[PDB]
Amino acid sequence: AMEYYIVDSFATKLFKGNPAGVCVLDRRIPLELMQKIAEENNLPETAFVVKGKGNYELRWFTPKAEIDLCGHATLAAAYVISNFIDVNVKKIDFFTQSGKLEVTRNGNLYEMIFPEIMPIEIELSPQQANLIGCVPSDVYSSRDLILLLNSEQEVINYKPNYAQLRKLTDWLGIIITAQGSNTDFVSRYFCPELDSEDPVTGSSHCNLIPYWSEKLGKHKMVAAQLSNRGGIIQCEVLKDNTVKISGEAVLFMQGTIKI
């Protein structure tokens, strides 16, 4: 009865990027049923789109809980809307727990506008320096901890110790970043409480874009997220202290949930 899609966000090819389930509903279903569906899919997130008169309500669930924001699964939901629901629509508005989110389709690229957040350089305490599991060139701070490494090779070589990273309670996630070989810059994002590496992270680019824009002297850049799956992020510094984050999406599976 409900249309269901598995989509790879920020992916140039199948099995890359950040995978999400996307469930498109004609009518409301209980939040407890959305949670059971997300647990059954066992994908990092299942997005639920309620198509109503004049608007889309969007919720996201991990296999364990409802969450209030998810940029990468929002890109997957916009891909589903413009490819199957309102074929070739350019502007997709979603009403969520965190307010209205807009996604713009530009060719086959999905664009999201986020606040520009230049991080601040900090000095780690001797104890914090022993928890990061590397010797960075510089350390920056925002919602996440940003570790500047000396090369793309050092970013690739890093092996997270989640037990140690969980002790860095001042930050949500741990970012490692460096200049890229094939791209302007690269990064990897670690989720210590989830014991996992995020395949592709849009919101880290709120910090990474102003930081690399200043270092490289560029307003338009390409970034790679060097996770196992890997992601490509189109980056642009906009006028009013905002940044544009864009990515491609790929369809893995199209079906129906029998409820």
Added chain:
Amino acid sequence: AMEYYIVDSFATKLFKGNPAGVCVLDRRIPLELMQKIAEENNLPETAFVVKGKGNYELRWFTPKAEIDLCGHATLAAAYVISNFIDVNVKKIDFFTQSGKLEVTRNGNLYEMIFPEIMPIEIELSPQQANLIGCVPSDVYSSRDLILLLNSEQEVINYKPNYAQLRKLTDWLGIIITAQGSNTDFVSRYFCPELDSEDPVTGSSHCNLIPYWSEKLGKHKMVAAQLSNRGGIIQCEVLKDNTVKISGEAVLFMQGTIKI
């Protein structure tokens, strides 16, 4: 191009039992592609059925590797064959890494015949007794370690310590069992190296059936696997040192993989 199904095995209702992906192919695809598909699904196993002239080849992949046996995903594959491929076929033969497997559909129950394996009573060493995290009434040994608890409540109350259970290297899995409140007997199965509790385990019933058959004086019994999802297993002692293990299956999602 390939039909894809998500099925709950040993489940009387959706979101119960042991979930599996089932991919039905007209032609062979590379083993590396089957692995990528299993990793993309992120389900405990994805079963791949190759329908050829006169036979079915069956393989199973976890999100990490190909495996050589999987009774619960085999039940899901048989459910898919008899409900969608060869509608209402009663006998399903599969050719696998571990030889030929037969599944019989009896109404909506799927039957699998396994060897009867009466386990042997053992005495744990003081060190092993400290690793099991309980004080059992009796201890039995086979491929898995079997811990007889004093009630269904004690089975429900048990909370596995996988770090401690991983130190019991003499056994594959750790089984806790007791007489049931609503069923003849109950069990929970722990996979220490997988850091997980198995939702429903068919092969543990190779030991549990002869053991409870002798204790209860019954040839036909019903068992429950008291995992979070939960499973119901129809049990029967057969004539030639074999046992019959049966379960229901439920369809969660039907779709197509775009490859």
